[PDB]
């Protein structure tokens, strides 16, 4: 269940709800699948 | 607010909702069944009982013939009223009017509805049954029921 | 005026190897010109989507929306052609892979307003768009998990550089 | 009042692609086991319903036929009677009037 | 070894299945007819030995794919998933038909099936009885003292079995066959025995659930996945291992549920 | 009759001999299949008549046939003859043919690749008689030959609907 997921998410790892919730189509196009990798 | 408020809001007042109701309760007199729309129906199926009981009281009672004439509205109907419905139903109590779903008017998608009175002379209606008795989980509860008495 | 979506039926491609994936036949319908708003057919399209050909049918069929006779027709003469024209043995195995509504050409018309004024009326139409598969429809997105989402963030976690230096 | 500004396309699909106003899938649908046509829960088949509407219309249009005129209503509980107060007919019964 | 013999079984099967294919010269076809109270008079242009009755349903629509249970060809039930051999008379059965016994046989069959196929991973089979759907049971005995614990791991490897959604293989199988693949039990060889002895052909009935092969008299059903409420009772002393289970398509809910489980139990 | 629909033939062409016509027609034909499997109807249309052509590429659309010819069985025969002016020759075949009919996404719907079967055919040819030429116009179903291979695909025949 999503909300209390959430929850035990930031529990587990200690941080902000905002992360978790999933973005949305637009932004994730935009992400690069094969970025510049070095080293 | 309109908190224990019976009676739907129909035509163009209550005048005109009673004129209404009239016109559905001869309809199904002359006919034994109508289709009509569902919110209307309730209505014309409470108002249908009521009369019926009415007319089971006999011709000889002033008040119920006065009343077959304010409702019945082309006046051959009474006669059926009394002379046929009342025999009909003279063992039952309440049961008459059987009210069920019709798929949707076409134009206005109107929630549907048909109203019978009980028995009558036209063909069936396509009826929803129970599940029949020899199904598993039937089975199973006749089998508890079976061990039940077989206990008691 | 174009239409790429009838033509779409008229590709070939080019026969199978013995050991190859089966390749499933895609199917492609239309109705040009319906009396509808494309956003109105946009709905029901949504509403089709991802489903067994059956199951949108079972849909539309007590959908009460004038689109929806439509689409149930549309859907209907679709199956009629996987049957015949396309080689498509059992029509059960059909699943709505695309469903879209484009707008169709719109005639103009004086709507006369209060006052000496006047807007100008626009009758709309829309073209419904249709592309059947042969296959059992995919399985939907499982939501992902807790875990999953630790999973991502400790991916990210690692991911890191020192940004600039070296 | 006016729009102060030109609502812009993505909220828009915002607003209108929202899931209130996407259409229900609906779970009311199983098949008619008589005749097979499908129909909802808590609602008399479409095509089974059909049939029987087609039948008091032909008995009505036969009583009519019977009942010269307007305003008559007989004093009798009628019956229907295919091949072989009595209403005439023709054809046998269907596998449902009984 | 319990290791080596499902392996061994399972082959033998598939060499089994593949000579049955054998016969067959390059897809013969026959027209198989529906019979029914609706879609009628439909024919179907069927290939022998491959097509099933499923194939049958699926061309009709995908509703009665879902719905249907045992196939009626020539008045007897044929399994979904078992092929048309001739040109015959086809009809679907539901559980929510007037006349559904046939139906509910079959599914305690499967139900039994499943829970020796648990019996077996959980930790030698004599039979499933031949139980009556009022009898309040599917029952299965077994040849070894278990808690509710125990009882409750056996009703979650059921489940899991269940979600895993496995088709029932199907065969008819000369005797010889089936005494080989079973030769290490005996009790399940006699039963083999008794089966042939029962018919003129020795066509003994090999049903299989993945990994998992026995013997059963009737027909089964298609899928694990139609056992939607599936639970394992108690065990009574030979340990006949009892159960009850209620399908999708007729749902019991919760009250109603732990009666028929209470019931089960004596 | 057939004799005298032969001089008539001859009379109008004018050079015309019968006793190589059989193998001419053969080759005519697995011109006429080659050109099928490649869709020349460029190459068709000198071949086959205006009858026979959409009875044999209209079914046969957007669909790749892969046939082959081999080893003709017997000689090729001629039997009956007959005669605006559009004249009338019919010939019988035996010979080996393969067929394999792939659909628009790839697939196999009709026969064996490489598995040749022995096929009869009543092939029936017409010609014009000022720059005519002998084509095919029919194939007569008879004598009563052991049905065709059967379809791989299975299919379902609707009854009456109410
Ligand atoms: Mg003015
Ligand atoms: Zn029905």
């Given at each position: ?39 | ?50 009369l019926i009981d009415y007319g089971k009281l006999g011709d000889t009672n002033e008040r119920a013939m006065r009343m077959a004439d304010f409702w019945l509205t082309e006046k051959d109907l009474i006669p059926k009223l009394f002379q046929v419905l009342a025999p009909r139903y003279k063992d039952q109590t309440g ?58 | ?166 | ?98 | ?15 089994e299945k593949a000579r049955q294919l054998s016969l067959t010269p390059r897809t013969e076809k026959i027209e198989v007819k529906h019979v029914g109270k609706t879609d ?227 | ?162």
């Amino acid at each position: 269940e999503e909300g209390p997921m959430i929850e035990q998410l930031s529990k587990m790892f200690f941080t902000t709800k905002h992360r978790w919730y999933p973005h949305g189509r637009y932004h994730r196009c935009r992400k690069n699948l094969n970025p510049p990798k070095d080293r | 607010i309109s908190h224990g408020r019976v009676f739907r809001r129909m035509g163009l007042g209550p005048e005109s909702r009673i004129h209404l109701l009239r016109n559905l309760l001869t309809g199904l007199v002359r006919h034994e069944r109508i289709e009509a729309p569902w919110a209307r129906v309730d209505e014309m199926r409470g108002y249908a009982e009521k009369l019926i009981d009415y007319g089971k009281l006999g011709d000889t009672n002033e008040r119920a013939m006065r009343m077959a004439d304010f409702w019945l509205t082309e006046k051959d109907l009474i006669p059926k009223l009394f002379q046929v419905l009342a025999p009909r139903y003279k063992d039952q109590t309440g049961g008459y009017t059987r009210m069920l779903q019709i798929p949707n008017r076409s134009l206005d998608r109107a929630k549907m509805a048909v109203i019978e009175y009980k028995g009558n002379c036209l063909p069936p209606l396509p009826l929803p049954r129970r599940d029949s008795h020899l199904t598993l989980l039937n089975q199973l509860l006749q089998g508890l029921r079976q061990d039940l008495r077989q206990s008691q | 005026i174009s239409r790429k979506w009838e033509k779409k039926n008229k590709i070939v491609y080019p026969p199978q190897l013995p050991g190859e994936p089966r390749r499933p036949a895609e199917i492609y319908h239309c109705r040009r010109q319906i009396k509808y708003s494309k956003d109105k057919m946009w709905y029901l399209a949504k509403l089709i989507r991802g489903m067994s050909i059956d199951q949108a049918l079972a849909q539309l069929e007590f959908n009460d929306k004038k689109g929806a006779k439509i689409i149930k027709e549309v859907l209907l003469e679709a199956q009629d052609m996987a049957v015949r024209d396309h080689n498509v043995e059992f029509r059960s195995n059909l699943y709505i892979a695309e469903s879209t509504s484009g707008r169709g050409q719109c005639l103009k018309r004086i709507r006369y307003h209060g006052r000496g004024r006047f807007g100008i009326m626009e009758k709309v139409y829309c073209h419904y768009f249709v592309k059947l598969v042969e296959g059992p429809p995919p399985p939907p997105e499982p939501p992902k998990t807790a875990v999953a989402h630790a999973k991502e963030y400790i991916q990210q976690l690692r991911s890191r550089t020192i940004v600039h230096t070296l | 009042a006016a729009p102060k500004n030109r609502r812009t396309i993505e909220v828009n699909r915002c607003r209108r692609r929202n899931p209130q106003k996407l259409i229900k899938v609906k779970n009311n649908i199983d098949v008619c086991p008589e005749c097979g046509h499908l129909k909802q829960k808590h609602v008399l088949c479409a095509y089974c319903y059909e049939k029987v509407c087609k039948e008091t219309a032909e008995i009505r249009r036969q009583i009519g036929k019977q009942e010269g005129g307007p305003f008559k209503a007989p004093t009798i509980e009628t019956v229907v009677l295919y091949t072989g107060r009595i209403i005439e007919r023709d054809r046998k019964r269907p596998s449902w009037f009984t | 070894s319990p290791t080596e013999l499902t392996e061994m079984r399972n082959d033998l099967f598939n060499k089994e299945k593949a000579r049955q294919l054998s016969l067959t010269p390059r897809t013969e076809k026959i027209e198989v007819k529906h019979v029914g109270k609706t879609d009628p008079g439909t024919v179907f242009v069927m290939n022998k030995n491959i097509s099933t009755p499923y194939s049958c349903a699926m061309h009709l629509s995908e509703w009665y794919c879902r719905k249907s249970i045992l196939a009626l060809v020539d008045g007897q039930p044929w399994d979904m998933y078992k092929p048309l051999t001739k040109s015959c008379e086809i009809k679907f059965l539901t559980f929510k038909d007037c006349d559904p016994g046939e139906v509910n046989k079959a599914y305690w069959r499967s139900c039994a099936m499943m829970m020796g196929c648990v019996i077996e991973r959980a930790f030698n089979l004599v039979r499933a009885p031949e139980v009556p759907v009022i009898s309040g049971a599917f029952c299965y005995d077994v040849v070894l003292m278990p808690t509710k614990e125990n009882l409750r791991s056996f009703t979650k490897d059921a489940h899991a079995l269940i979600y895993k959604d496995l088709p029932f293989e199907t065969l008819e199988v000369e005797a010889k066959v089936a005494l080989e693949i079973f030769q290490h039990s005996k009790y399940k060889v006699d039963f083999i025995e008794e089966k042939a002895s029962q018919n003129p052909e020795r066509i003994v009935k090999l049903h299989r659930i993945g990994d998992f092969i026995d013997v059963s008299e009737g027909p089964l059903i298609p899928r694990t996945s139609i056992c939607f409420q599936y639970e394992v009772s108690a065990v009574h002393n030979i340990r006949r291992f009892q159960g009850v289970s209620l399908p999708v398509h007729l749902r019991a809910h919760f009250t109603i549920w732990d009666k028929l489980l209470e019931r089960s139990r004596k | 009759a057939s004799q005298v629909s032969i001089r008539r033939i001859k009379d109008y062409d004018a050079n015309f001999k019968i006793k190589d016509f059989p193998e001419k027609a053969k080759d005519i034909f697995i011109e006429a299949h080659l050109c099928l499997n490649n869709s020349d109807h460029d190459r068709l249309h000198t071949l086959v008549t205006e009858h026979c052509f959409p009875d044999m590429t209209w079914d046969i659309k957007y669909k790749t046939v892969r046939w082959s010819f081999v080893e003709s069985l017997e000689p090729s025969h001629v039997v009956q003859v007959r005669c605006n002016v559009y004249g009338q020759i019919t010939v019988r075949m035996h010979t080996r043919q393969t067929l394999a009919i792939y659909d628009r996404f790839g697939r196999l719907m009709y026969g064996q690749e490489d598995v040749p079967k022995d096929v009869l055919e009543y092939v029936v040819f017409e010609k014009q008689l000022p720059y005519g030429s002998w084509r095919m116009h029919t194939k007569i179903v008879p004598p009563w030959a052991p049905p065709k291979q059967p379809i791989l695909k299975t299919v379902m025949i609707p009854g009456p609907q109410l």
